[PDB]
Design an enzyme around this catalytic site. Sequence first.
Site, short mmCIF file in Angstrom:
data_model
loop_
_atom_site.label_atom_id
_atom_site.label_comp_id
_atom_site.label_asym_id
_atom_site.label_seq_id
_atom_site.Cartn_x
_atom_site.Cartn_y
_atom_site.Cartn_z
N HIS A 193 -7.04 9.29 -0.94
CA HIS A 193 -7.76 9.26 0.33
C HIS A 193 -7.08 9.97 1.51
O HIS A 193 -7.54 9.84 2.65
CB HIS A 193 -8.14 7.82 0.71
CG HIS A 193 -6.99 6.86 0.72
ND1 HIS A 193 -6.55 6.21 -0.41
CD2 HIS A 193 -6.18 6.46 1.73
CE1 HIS A 193 -5.52 5.44 -0.10
NE2 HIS A 193 -5.28 5.57 1.19
N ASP B 181 0.81 5.29 -0.33
CA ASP B 181 0.04 6.52 -0.31
C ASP B 181 0.69 7.63 -1.11
O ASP B 181 1.84 7.98 -0.86
CB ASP B 181 -0.13 7.02 1.13
CG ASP B 181 -1.00 6.11 1.95
OD1 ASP B 181 -2.12 5.82 1.49
OD2 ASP B 181 -0.55 5.68 3.04
N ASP C 67 1.59 -1.27 4.54
CA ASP C 67 2.06 0.01 4.01
C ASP C 67 3.51 0.01 3.55
O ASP C 67 4.43 -0.35 4.29
CB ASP C 67 1.85 1.12 5.06
CG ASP C 67 0.39 1.49 5.22
OD1 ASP C 67 -0.48 0.71 4.77
OD2 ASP C 67 0.10 2.57 5.79
N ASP D 278 -8.13 0.99 1.43
CA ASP D 278 -7.99 2.03 2.45
C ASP D 278 -8.98 3.21 2.54
O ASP D 278 -8.99 3.92 3.54
CB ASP D 278 -6.57 2.60 2.40
CG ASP D 278 -6.09 3.04 3.77
OD1 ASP D 278 -5.24 3.94 3.83
OD2 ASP D 278 -6.54 2.49 4.80
N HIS E 290 0.83 -1.20 0.00
CA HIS E 290 0.00 0.00 0.00
C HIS E 290 0.87 1.26 0.00
O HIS E 290 1.56 1.55 0.98
CB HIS E 290 -0.94 -0.01 1.21
CG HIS E 290 -1.93 1.11 1.22
ND1 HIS E 290 -2.88 1.28 0.22
CD2 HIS E 290 -2.13 2.12 2.09
CE1 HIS E 290 -3.61 2.34 0.49
NE2 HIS E 290 -3.17 2.87 1.62
O1 LIG Z 1 -1.21 2.29 8.80
C1 LIG Z 1 -2.02 3.02 8.23
N1 LIG Z 1 -2.36 2.87 6.97
C2 LIG Z 1 -3.33 3.87 6.54
C3 LIG Z 1 -2.58 4.84 5.38
O2 LIG Z 1 -2.38 4.15 4.41
C4 LIG Z 1 -3.31 6.22 5.33
O3 LIG Z 1 -3.66 6.59 4.01
C5 LIG Z 1 -4.55 6.43 6.27
O4 LIG Z 1 -4.87 7.83 6.29
C6 LIG Z 1 -4.31 5.98 7.77
C7 LIG Z 1 -5.67 5.81 8.49
O5 LIG Z 1 -5.52 5.27 9.81
N2 LIG Z 1 -3.53 4.68 7.75
C8 LIG Z 1 -2.78 4.21 8.77
O6 LIG Z 1 -2.73 4.66 9.93
ZN LIG Z 2 -3.76 4.74 2.53
#
Ligand SMILES: O=C1N[C@@H]2[C@@H](O)[C@@H](O)[C@H](O)[C@@H](CO)N2C1=O
Ligand SMILES: [Zn+2]
EC number: 3.2.1.114
Length: 1014
Positions: A441, A62, A311, A174, A60
């Site tokens: 997101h 971001d 992630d 996500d 994953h």
């Molecule tokens: O470990 C995590 N993965 C997701 C991310 O990928 C992130 O985009 C989210 O905002 C966020 C939402 O909790 N996230 C985390 O804390």
């Molecule tokens: Zn994410």
Amino acid sequence: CQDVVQDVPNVDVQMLELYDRMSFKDIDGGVWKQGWNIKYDPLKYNAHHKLKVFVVPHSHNDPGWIQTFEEYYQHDTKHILSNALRHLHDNPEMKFIWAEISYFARFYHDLGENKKLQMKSIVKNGQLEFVTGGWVMPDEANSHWRNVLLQLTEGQTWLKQFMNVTPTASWAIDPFGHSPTMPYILQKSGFKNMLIQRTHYSVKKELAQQRQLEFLWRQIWDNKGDTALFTHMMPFYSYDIPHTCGPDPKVCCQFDFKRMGSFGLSCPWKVPPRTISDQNVAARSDLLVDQWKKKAELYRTNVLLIPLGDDFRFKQNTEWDVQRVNYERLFEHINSQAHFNVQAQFGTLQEYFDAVHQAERAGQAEFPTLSGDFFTYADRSDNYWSGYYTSRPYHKRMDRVLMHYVRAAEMLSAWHSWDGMARIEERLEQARRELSLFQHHDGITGTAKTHVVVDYEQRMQEALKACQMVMQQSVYRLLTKPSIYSPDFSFSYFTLDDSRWPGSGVEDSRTTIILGEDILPSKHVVMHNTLPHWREQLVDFYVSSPFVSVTDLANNPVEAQVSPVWSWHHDTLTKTIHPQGSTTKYRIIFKARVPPMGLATYVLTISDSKPEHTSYASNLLLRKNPTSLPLGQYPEDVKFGDPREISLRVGNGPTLAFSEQGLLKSIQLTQDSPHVPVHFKFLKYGVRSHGDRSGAYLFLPNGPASPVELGQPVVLVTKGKLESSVSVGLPSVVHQTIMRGGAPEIRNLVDIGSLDNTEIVMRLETHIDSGDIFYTDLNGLQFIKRRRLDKLPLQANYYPIPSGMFIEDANTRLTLLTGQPLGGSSLASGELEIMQDRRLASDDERGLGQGVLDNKPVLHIYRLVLEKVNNCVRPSKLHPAGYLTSAAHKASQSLLDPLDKFIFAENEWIGAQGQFGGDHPSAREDLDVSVMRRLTKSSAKTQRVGYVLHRTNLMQCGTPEEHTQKLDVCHLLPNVARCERTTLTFLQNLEHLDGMVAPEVCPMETAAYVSSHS
Ligand SMILES: O=C1N[C@@H]2[C@@H](O)[C@@H](O)[C@H](O)[C@@H](CO)N2C1=O
Ligand SMILES: [Zn+2]
Ligand SMILES: CC(=O)N[C@@H]1[C@@H](O)[C@H](O)[C@@H](CO)O[C@H]1O
């Protein structure tokens, strides 16, 4: 055309109905904390019925969150992708899926030809598989469907060109909650399967118990089911390895081999993973297979999906090895031990879906149908993620502005083929990509760190400049005599004038048209109408003199109204918020009539005295102890008075009454009708002193909101023939109600200043007998029925308000349209409320590592429509959908796609023409040309232009509304050789249209067409 109003679809699972029945009890279910102890019959499997397991490695990534896109790229992603290429090349059985094309494209263009060829090969052979294929994995709450399609198209177009593949399976692990807008668009873009993860824990439990985690997701109004898309909902709390192998994270964590120490990761359940060996593989396999078999009990086939990732995973070479070698040992043991009756292997998402459907066709499974959405998400206890529906509202509003500029730039420039020197394609690609990136997101959701938000804003600012350049070059070419046209592709022939962004009080950026006898007597201005129907709308410009008159290109006078330029200031000395008028700048307002998808030119001329066709607004400052307000040359003197209730009415429209605090109190539609109680009020929500704190993601109020103390605010009333308004300086908000003859427009200049742990909400109180029912839209595409549930906490009753919301009873409806996505609800019968901004001091434990303390002034815009609906043909009580009226829809369009205004830069525009598109068909009001984009560069013999056509559904309420021409997009350009219906991304031809005519679409349908020209 299927009727989207009168036939209630019969589905196995209808989310609103499900929500009505569910208890939402949060009990400890054991190792699977939010489930129950899964049990399975060991005899279920044998040599004749094996469990097929697909372990799908993923990472994953971001496109911005705690680091910027480029920061993550340099530090993690480029390494992940580089080592993925190496490891997949060297290990033919290993697999890997990739979702974010923005990162893949960034990486690909930095590769040498040798590597590009190796990459194309592992994709072609099925080792590396793209899932969804969008520029990003978009937010599904705040995003507009138009931008969801934009980013999907940006990613897939890149994939088809450079990887020769188009994903038919979507992966969304996500986004914080899921919307049916996704299957809608995907199904119309060639997709056959989709996967989602973040849904309320109570919903996961409920559907798991009935084995309804895989379903055919159709739209709420679809009675036939043609919109259905097979969907797989993951059953557990997270997509990480501890929550994807089975119900017990303590066991699953032991199979995430990157958690043994040297990587700085461990297992919170306290049992570490152990390197698989010949001496422990049997016991390890026994633990793992048992987890798999339990997970399998939640689904209807013998095909199991086991994601393997987290992630930014699969970065280091050692990580690839540790995960691959250990799983390889487990597979060899498991697959050779007959007693397990399991065949496990690395696979891709498409492989999983293909296997499931093969089982389905073998008749081993029948899947349930489902309609509805998956908001509002809660991952545990009372932690509902409704806060991000409002977080960083400045950028949420910016998203909508850019959305429109991108559409206008692509449309305006699509009329001509441009020379490469014009850099049109270049600028448009940048604009599409920056807006596409923001759909992430952690982008539009407002959940990124402060410096990452700045990066997104900078990128969008550049995108806006790009669209302006393309737009103004286009206008010059479209309205200049051909034989005179002499473009300098770097020159600014026109400047865009935008009265609502950044907005008055946010940034003083609009230019004043400077006229003077000794400098310039007149100036040409041009309006653009991106909508496919004739449109009239008041437009305004700042001028250096109040004595200005307007005419069209045929020199016909146009009625105009001049008003002062008022700016509000928090007076540090007097400690009051009051307006100041300009003494050298004035606003001129007039109605512009513009052709469908066209242009209209007007001229502003100065005179020494009041021109015949220009009137002047009166101004009344209401407050005690007032001081003079000089206005330079302005004709009328400002009037003063003590605070008092006031009433206004522009034209033959509605009459509005206001309180002495400048807030709406009632609306009278006609001189006969009663004064309907419609009260605006501002309140504030706080943060809990105990328990969990609200943050960028979570909304955890410390009880219902408390009224904001208003004191004795200063009220400014401007009354004119064409436009009138009432503005009030309240604490944190300059509230304005504007009237132009129809539905009023509301504007809030929101500056939450230093008010920590405060959320400002705007509420409307009425007598409408709505009960516990209200409607909100999904991605500006459809309106879904909501039911307030008192069995759920306040924050659970908050929903995304991407474009509008409304309440109604048997006879009356109140609709509030928005120009930006924000959070809202109806907490009591007859009420509507929408959050303006929120400033939070602490982190809400979801990974951001900060609260929200970077608030900045933002101008929120709305339209308020009060209507009688006792004569409208509405859906039955059991229908899950709702539909807007003609007025409400047009009001929404006035907010999202207003006329564009251009001011000629030079002193004289030689060869200027008065109009463009006068011959364009004026289509039925419910039809829109959402996208117009030339798909070919100038060197292509056969030019291609793509169009996306969307038709919404408007209620029939007894208005004749007739005479409109049919719109055939394929004939909008000359020399058409062929017309084809395509997927919404324009990537696949679905139909060769006879006669080269593109037929219009049905209500709630969206179609794409491509016309070819020789
Ligand atoms: O470990 C995590 N993965 C997701 C991310 O990928 C992130 O985009 C989210 O905002 C966020 C939402 O909790 N996230 C985390 O804390
Ligand atoms: Zn994410
Ligand atoms: C990129 C390329 O030229 N390779 C071809 C492609 O043109 C064709 O569309 C595809 C069919 O799926 O088969 C590939 O081998």
